[PDB]
Design an enzyme around this catalytic site. Sequence first.
Site, PDB file in Angstrom:
ATOM      1  N   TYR A 141      -5.503 -10.923  -1.628  1.00  0.00           N
ATOM      2  CA  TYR A 141      -5.578  -9.484  -1.853  1.00  0.00           C
ATOM      3  C   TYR A 141      -4.376  -8.788  -1.225  1.00  0.00           C
ATOM      4  O   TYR A 141      -3.703  -7.982  -1.871  1.00  0.00           O
ATOM      5  CB  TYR A 141      -6.868  -8.912  -1.259  1.00  0.00           C
ATOM      6  CG  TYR A 141      -7.029  -7.431  -1.508  1.00  0.00           C
ATOM      7  CD1 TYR A 141      -7.194  -6.938  -2.802  1.00  0.00           C
ATOM      8  CD2 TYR A 141      -6.981  -6.517  -0.455  1.00  0.00           C
ATOM      9  CE1 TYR A 141      -7.305  -5.570  -3.043  1.00  0.00           C
ATOM     10  CE2 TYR A 141      -7.090  -5.147  -0.687  1.00  0.00           C
ATOM     11  CZ  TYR A 141      -7.249  -4.681  -1.981  1.00  0.00           C
ATOM     12  OH  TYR A 141      -7.342  -3.327  -2.214  1.00  0.00           O
ATOM     13  N   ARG A 179      -7.610  -1.910  11.402  1.00  0.00           N
ATOM     14  CA  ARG A 179      -7.622  -0.623  12.084  1.00  0.00           C
ATOM     15  C   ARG A 179      -8.478   0.429  11.384  1.00  0.00           C
ATOM     16  O   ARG A 179      -9.314   1.081  12.011  1.00  0.00           O
ATOM     17  CB  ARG A 179      -6.190  -0.108  12.214  1.00  0.00           C
ATOM     18  CG  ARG A 179      -6.060   1.286  12.797  1.00  0.00           C
ATOM     19  CD  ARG A 179      -4.664   1.825  12.550  1.00  0.00           C
ATOM     20  NE  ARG A 179      -4.363   1.878  11.120  1.00  0.00           N
ATOM     21  CZ  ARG A 179      -3.181   2.209  10.611  1.00  0.00           C
ATOM     22  NH1 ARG A 179      -2.171   2.511  11.414  1.00  0.00           N
ATOM     23  NH2 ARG A 179      -3.009   2.230   9.296  1.00  0.00           N
ATOM     24  N   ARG A 213     -15.820   1.720   0.785  1.00  0.00           N
ATOM     25  CA  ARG A 213     -15.062   0.534   0.403  1.00  0.00           C
ATOM     26  C   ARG A 213     -15.015  -0.492   1.528  1.00  0.00           C
ATOM     27  O   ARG A 213     -15.218  -0.159   2.696  1.00  0.00           O
ATOM     28  CB  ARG A 213     -13.642   0.924  -0.018  1.00  0.00           C
ATOM     29  CG  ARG A 213     -12.876   1.733   1.010  1.00  0.00           C
ATOM     30  CD  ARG A 213     -11.517   2.143   0.464  1.00  0.00           C
ATOM     31  NE  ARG A 213     -10.746   2.936   1.417  1.00  0.00           N
ATOM     32  CZ  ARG A 213     -11.105   4.139   1.856  1.00  0.00           C
ATOM     33  NH1 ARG A 213     -12.231   4.697   1.428  1.00  0.00           N
ATOM     34  NH2 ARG A 213     -10.338   4.786   2.723  1.00  0.00           N
ATOM     35  N   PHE A 254      14.355  -0.003   8.963  1.00  0.00           N
ATOM     36  CA  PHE A 254      13.328   0.155   7.939  1.00  0.00           C
ATOM     37  C   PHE A 254      12.227  -0.904   8.008  1.00  0.00           C
ATOM     38  O   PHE A 254      11.067  -0.626   7.702  1.00  0.00           O
ATOM     39  CB  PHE A 254      13.987   0.121   6.557  1.00  0.00           C
ATOM     40  CG  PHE A 254      13.019   0.244   5.418  1.00  0.00           C
ATOM     41  CD1 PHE A 254      12.310   1.422   5.217  1.00  0.00           C
ATOM     42  CD2 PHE A 254      12.813  -0.821   4.548  1.00  0.00           C
ATOM     43  CE1 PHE A 254      11.410   1.540   4.163  1.00  0.00           C
ATOM     44  CE2 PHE A 254      11.916  -0.715   3.493  1.00  0.00           C
ATOM     45  CZ  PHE A 254      11.211   0.469   3.300  1.00  0.00           C
TER      46      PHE A 254
END
Lengths: 330, 325, 328, 332, 332, 329
Positions: free
Chosen positions: A135, A182, A192, A252
């Site tokens: 997933y 978290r 969900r 980044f």
Amino acid sequence: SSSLKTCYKYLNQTSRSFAAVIQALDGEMRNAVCIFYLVLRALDTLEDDMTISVEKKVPLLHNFHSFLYQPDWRFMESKEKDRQVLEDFPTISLEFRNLAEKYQTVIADICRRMGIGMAEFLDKHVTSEQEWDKYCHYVAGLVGIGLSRLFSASEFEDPLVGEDTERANSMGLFLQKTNIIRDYLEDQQGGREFWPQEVWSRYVKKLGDFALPENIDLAVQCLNELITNALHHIPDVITYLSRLRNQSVFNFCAIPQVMAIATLAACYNNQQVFKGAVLIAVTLMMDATNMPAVKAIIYQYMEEIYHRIPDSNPSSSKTRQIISTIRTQN
Amino acid sequence: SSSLKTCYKYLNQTSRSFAAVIQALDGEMRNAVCIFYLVLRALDTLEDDMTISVEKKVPLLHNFHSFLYQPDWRFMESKEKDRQVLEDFPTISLEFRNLAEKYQTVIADICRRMGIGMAEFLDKHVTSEQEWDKYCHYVAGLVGIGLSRLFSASEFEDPLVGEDTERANSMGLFLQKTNIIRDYLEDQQGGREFWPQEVWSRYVKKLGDFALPENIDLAVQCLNELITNALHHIPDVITYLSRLRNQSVFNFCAIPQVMAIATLAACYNNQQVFKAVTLMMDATNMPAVKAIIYQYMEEIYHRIPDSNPSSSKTRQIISTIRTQN
Amino acid sequence: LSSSLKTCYKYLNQTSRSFAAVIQALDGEMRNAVCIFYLVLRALDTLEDDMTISVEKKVPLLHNFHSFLYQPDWRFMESKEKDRQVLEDFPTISLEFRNLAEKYQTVIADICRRMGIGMAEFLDKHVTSEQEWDKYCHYVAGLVGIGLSRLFSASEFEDPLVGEDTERANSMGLFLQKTNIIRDYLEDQQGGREFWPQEVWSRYVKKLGDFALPENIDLAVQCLNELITNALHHIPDVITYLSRLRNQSVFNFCAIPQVMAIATLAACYNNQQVFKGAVAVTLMMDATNMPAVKAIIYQYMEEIYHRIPDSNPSSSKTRQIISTIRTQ
Amino acid sequence: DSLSSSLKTCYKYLNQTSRSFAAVIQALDGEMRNAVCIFYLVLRALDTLEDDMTISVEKKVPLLHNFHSFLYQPDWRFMESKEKDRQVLEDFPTISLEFRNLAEKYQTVIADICRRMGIGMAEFLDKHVTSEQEWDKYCHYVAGLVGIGLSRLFSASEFEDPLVGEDTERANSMGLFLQKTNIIRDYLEDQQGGREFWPQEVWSRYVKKLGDFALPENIDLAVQCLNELITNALHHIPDVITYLSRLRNQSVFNFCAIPQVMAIATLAACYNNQQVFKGAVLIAVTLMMDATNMPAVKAIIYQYMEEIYHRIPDSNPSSSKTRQIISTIRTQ
Amino acid sequence: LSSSLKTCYKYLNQTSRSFAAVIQALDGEMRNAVCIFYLVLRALDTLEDDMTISVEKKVPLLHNFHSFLYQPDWRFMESKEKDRQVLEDFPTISLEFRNLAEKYQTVIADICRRMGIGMAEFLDKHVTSEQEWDKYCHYVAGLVGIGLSRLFSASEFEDPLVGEDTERANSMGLFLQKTNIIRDYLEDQQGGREFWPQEVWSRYVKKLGDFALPENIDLAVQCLNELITNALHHIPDVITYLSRLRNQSVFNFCAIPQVMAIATLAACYNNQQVFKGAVLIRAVTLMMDATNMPAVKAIIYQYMEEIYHRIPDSNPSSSKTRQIISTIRTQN
Amino acid sequence: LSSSLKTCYKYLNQTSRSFAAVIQALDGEMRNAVCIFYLVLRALDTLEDDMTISVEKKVPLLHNFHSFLYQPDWRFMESKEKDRQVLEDFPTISLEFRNLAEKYQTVIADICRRMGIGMAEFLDKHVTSEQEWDKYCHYVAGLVGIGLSRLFSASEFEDPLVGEDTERANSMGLFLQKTNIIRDYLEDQQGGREFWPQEVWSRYVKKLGDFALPENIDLAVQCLNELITNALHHIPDVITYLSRLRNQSVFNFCAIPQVMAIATLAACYNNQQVFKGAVLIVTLMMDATNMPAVKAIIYQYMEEIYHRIPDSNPSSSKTRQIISTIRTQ
Ligand SMILES: CC(C)=CCC/C(C)=C/CNCCN[C@H]1[C@@H]2C[C@H]3C[C@@H](C2)C[C@@H]1C3
Ligand SMILES: CC(C)=CCC/C(C)=C/CNCCN[C@H]1[C@@H]2C[C@H]3C[C@@H](C2)C[C@@H]1C3
Ligand SMILES: CC(C)=CCC/C(C)=C/CNCCN[C@H]1[C@@H]2C[C@H]3C[C@@H](C2)C[C@@H]1C3
């Protein structure tokens, strides 16, 4: 180009912890990544809009990469907050087609490969840890590979970055798991679930039971097992970050990862993760702008965790095993 | 030379948010900037000193640049708290004449052109916004240029940094305006009025009216307007910093700018002015500097009341910075 | 990934909490070499630090300590220190050391020898003269600096000139030791040993243990101020040393310790809490680049300077040294 | 164009006095340029005084001893010089002007090297070089110090590691090697000049007058002395290499390498060569490289070494020693 | 330092025209490793060339040469060559060989063994097919290339890749070797030695010695060009190899020989002098030397056009000679 | 790998006497980028030079040349010069052009557009004032300097500042162009072409062609020495531009050309052979492979000219001033 202005306006509107580092990217990577984050946002805005039926959603997701090349397309039946990007999608599609085919290729490809995985879970749930990695691969893992492929296509990062789709995968899997772990509560109070059943099933009957004060102790144990699971991506995260050679690009990738570790170290064996909000010394002398500093910061957060590991904890033996590896390794 | 040690002593007695970073400079930039700062200080000390007849202070400002070549020149009448540099100027001028001739010209030139500007704005107050830039130029603009011309003179920086004075000027204007905008009360109890007339007058009668509570809603609308004006300089600041290549020089330029933006973000739409990823990276590289800036832009962009008349501009400008690239 | 190697890094994180992090950040081959170099020195100090042993048997061990690195079965079980695991399970440590490239084995083995010797030299006597205070610090720090300095050049991550500068590599170490001692005056006193240069406090109090008495806090601080002024003279060499490093991981490992040191002297200067317990632009830059380190150091030099009681017998001394650093 | 015109004059004299140095000197980076330029000029004017024999000794000494002091005498000059490079002395005020324009730290080095150098030059005004120890002492004052000065400057400009100037013995070697190589080749020229530089305790064991080697009939004994001296110089090579291998700045390396390289190139040609006493001497994998990197320099040096080894006459009384030193340099 | 070690470099300079300087310039351990590796290959080569040794005695020597390295007292006194010094005093070279790191010894011994077997199979045969010409060059040059590469990697002054890509390393050797064979045609032809691939020169003359005959100059040249064109196919690898080097001392060691070899080919191409003694080794090349890859590629391409601008249509290789050159051009 | 690209380098070596070897040494993309950027200019130049093409037919070609890069089937068969092969087979060149990365095309195309307008401007007028001599050199050489500078920065091999500073990039081109114009006087004269600034040679003769006559050789040298002195002023920027480079391959590509230029000016200074034909060309111990070397080399040549400056020369003073400036600062 006011059309480009709008995009960035939405970026800062749908990305509070990325817009800054993204807009700091050098040259081409900037607009590319900006757009790449706008399409995935819109795609995510669909998979979450429950007001849409699965029979009507699947199609929208499977043929999302196609709406890009369709100057008119735009979703208006969205009730979400990010709906703004879908309604004014033509603006995003406009800029998308303004990018070099190289970037248009990588993006469109990801949106396609991703539009399949997302719809694949619209009916099922994450059962095994293997299904959890799968997933995280569709919703975030690919996002990692997509960028790695853009950094190599931009010519700012060596080809190896976009080739080793493994690290690019681990990178995205580390942040996604850190988020899933978290945001447990809100995701639960949201209707969900993302936690691997085969894991929490050994503790309680339903995944939502952890939202009950009487099952707080069990909740922490499971929490630690999932946190120990995400710690395995670290070896790759470190290796990936050490291959970057462009400052803007490093800032980044580095920052997000470092905050993921800090969060895991702040959640490990912490009951607050089920109650409310959880907030994050040689680490005060350094910053995440160079490799040697990231490592030092990481190794510290590791000991911070390794020092709070209960001997009774069923997954304590494993937690130490991995931490012990990260220390010695290299 | 003890005369050199004396200069670095005044540098510390006079500076605070610089002394440390200035001494960090590499090679000869260290002494050049150190001395360049002291001379500009003494010049500024004579400008602020109110115990000096206008028809006595003008010549001093117009001829301050020349006293640098006079071994025994000095001033004793000064009563300011930094008169030490004036009374013992020979020490400073001495070390000035020891710097490479290529630096003497730069420092002398700025100090000469800056003395003229300050003499011009002695009997006047900032009226129009066009005049506001002019003032900031004679006090902070020329400074940014002088340094740029010094960094390129030492070769520690590309020759481009010293040529594009239009950018070096913005560096000064951005920092100057920031200080002025916040130091409203400060200069209000002193008797100075730096805020542009055509701006505050479009809200009240006297520039000191903002200090009155029943005008807090007009004061904040004038504040925001000015902050908006200053925000137009940021684009140049980024361009300027993007050209720097020497680390020591970068810390010297970047730090101040970043600290200035932080100020505007804390004063925007804030009445007290009349009474996330930033914690994971510092300003050592350009990408970080930008990232920091962008975040402060949103902090302000996420507090822009549609009721404020500047709402349009403020956003328009912030949108140009985030789009730049 | 050898289990014995893991056992070493596990002892590293135990015997240390402010170094283990940066040590593991060291690039490539230096990572292990240094980590090990730290452990072997822990055991060597654990012996001298243990009092259950007599000078009668100590001298031998210290002098031969360096040789035990080549004896797979050697270990010490007759020690009651919080760092026993390194001496008792030493075979696991020396084992990995035996796997380090020749280059590294040579350097480390040398330091252990030279260190052990002079280390045993002060087993009984005290630190009388200041010139002697440097001799001691040279054996318990200076060489350590020279060791690391020679290991950096060996790995080729640092210019070979780094290893040659033994003098500055020494000053680099003596700056940490002097600071460490000066700071831990209380613990060292409440332990049994004395490090403060006798010739310094002697002209302040007949017994170095008097500075712990409230009615002497004055003479105490003054003495402190004198020592701190003595340590500050090493700064020039420190700055010069760091100014040579070219590797980031190496810089981070050398700069941090130095910054924390100065951050301590500036906090202990003229501070009376030193005899009772423990203790702007700065927040804008990290010690990850030379220029930043300078700004940090110089900024601390001022917090010390602007607080020098002109009524102190060292005020003049302290001022000129914190002046040669500015003009430097 | 609107800057110091006196500095332009300084470089004019530099090209007038140093035909084969100015090019590389002007190639120096940053502060070093002017520093080394002014430094070379003050030593050239100081050399002109010593060389000018039309000046009594009782008069010349006071000038040498205080020459370093005239650097701070804005109007000091010298119009009684008859040498060719007298220009730097008559227009010295211009040179000293720029000397005082340098960082006060560069002045310290130059002023100092200039002072001690005067003391030495004075010592050898009323005497000649007898023993080798005396020969190395003289060369030290006129060259060994220049090596120390330049080195102390490089370190001062932070362009080179503080170790460069700290090691004064290696810098001295750099200076001695060039000076000796220069003297050995300048024999015939200094003979017609009335100045002897060859160590007596060396040429004496060959003839009675250093000028005898000029007389053709003693060309055999001449080449014998010529070879002993070259063998003496070659002992400075080990340090020349050690010194260069420490340099990190390219412009500096070029400034130090090129000279040393030509020095060995010269000794190589002069070795066992008789023309050293008849006329001026003159100049293959080296043709493939250039003295810009350390390893290349070594190759050039090593190759020039072997061009002397297979040239060593088995007869010559220096055989053993000549081969011995060349065997030490050849084996690291 | 060691009396035996200095003796090695002593022989190195008398058995190595201009290659000992470049070797002596190598860094760290490579310096000594290569010096010894060069001497052991010297003796081995000295035995192969010594014709006074019967094939019956030579064969055993070649096959067991590598084993003599570990035999403290082995020496050969029957050699009659001029470089026999290394054979008579082999125990010394042998002594130092055992002082090298075990890792270096493996390489030298291995390359020594394999090279012995090869030289042993061509003792009675002549090079026939082009495939055989490659087979031969590998034994006397290719292996030398593979050896050195594995020596640089072991010292860690380079990357493992160097010692792993034996093909590129082999081409480095074959290029230099083939170039020497193409040039020294006449020289070896005056010594009964035959190297030119019979399968190639047989399509022109009846016996390789005919190219020496004036009336066959036209044929001799066409054959010459055919072989040169062959050698050109090695450039791609040569360039690839040199580009992977990261050490300066090592680069100068490898780059110089290759460059100097291309220069020889360009000078020999379509030159009638190749059969009348030696050849004259003749732009932007003057302004730069071989010390940086970019310069080397420039110098290489430079010589590529040299040969290209001289390719006559009447030549049988004309079509395929430019084919390879046009390929070396495009390949970035 | 690429039948077409392989042909481009074939033409490069054909039309590039001494430049191809160095271009083929560039790293990464720059290699092809520069190769093509060169061939396109080779063609655009072959047209401007082709004297068999009327001005009214030439102006349109020069103005739209930049657009042909996007017209696959475009070519030119009427060319009669000797470097026409690139014009008759232009499609092969434009093909590889469209294959270059977009960032490179933008630059290459932009230069042609800019250069085209200029070349057409001087199609019927002769260089007059020195100020126009620089302008012309700007279109023929200056733009090439700014062009390459943008490519180096685009390829990421050179600092972004290299392509930003166009003033010194221009000088890098003018210095080389002037050296060519000055040297090829007799070569251009025997071809019906004048490049020497009229405002200058007009103060020595009545016709620029009079310098070919032996009785005016003395007046020719005086003019020659003046133009050379004029070109020396560009050195200060050349050293500045070179000192900004960092990539080895790029340095060699930019340094070498400049070095040969100085050597050429030194050989031509006060040299009468210039008007009677062509003139041939520490300096041995160090080559142009590093900034320090280049400088020393440049300085060596500077002194070569300086030592040969006639006191009577009407430019002697200026000749000295510039030398001193380059020498000192
Ligand atoms: C650069 C390397 C190697 C990995 C990137 C690691 C990384 C940020 C993964 C994204 N995981 C967070 C959840 N992703 C979502 C957010 C960001 C994108 C737009 C929105 C909001 C929908 C998803 C995609
Ligand atoms: C750079 C390193 C390591 C050493 C210096 C090596 C070096 C140039 C010695 C000078 N030896 C030649 C004789 N020197 C003379 C010339 C030059 C100076 C001015 C004039 C003319 C008088 C003397 C001093
Ligand atoms: C690298 C920096 C800063 C400048 C380059 C300097 C530089 C090549 C100027 C061009 N001046 C020579 C005349 N140029 C011509 C030749 C070469 C190209 C193809 C043909 C023949 C037409 C023109 C362009």
